[PDB]
A = this chain, B = another copy of it.
Amino acid sequence: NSDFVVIKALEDGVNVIGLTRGADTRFHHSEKLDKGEVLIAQFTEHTSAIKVRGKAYIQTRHGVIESEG
């Protein structure tokens, strides 16, 4: 039942990086998206923070935001 974010890649090679939940913080996975693909990604037991690199249109419960490459 956690929140989720919507990431639409606006160019090739966007990275959606999950950061580890817990006392330690590191990248545990980078999902690479190509232009026009959409990832819908939850917060989870393993992921408590999500970093987006590259150009993407993003939706979350607080509205739209855009990352730039």
Contacts and interface: CB of A to CB of B under 8 A. Distances in A.
Given A5-B40, A31-B19, A60 B62 contact: yes
Interface residues of A, number: 52
Interface in A1-31: 1-6, 8, 18-19, 21-25, 28-29, 31
Contacts of A38: 51-52, 56, 58, 65-67
Nearest to A62: B59
B59 A46 contact: no
The A interface is mostly helix, strand or loop, or mixed, namely strand
Contacts of A34: 53
Interface of A: 1-6, 8, 18-19, 21-25, 28-29, 31, 33-53, 55-63, 65-69
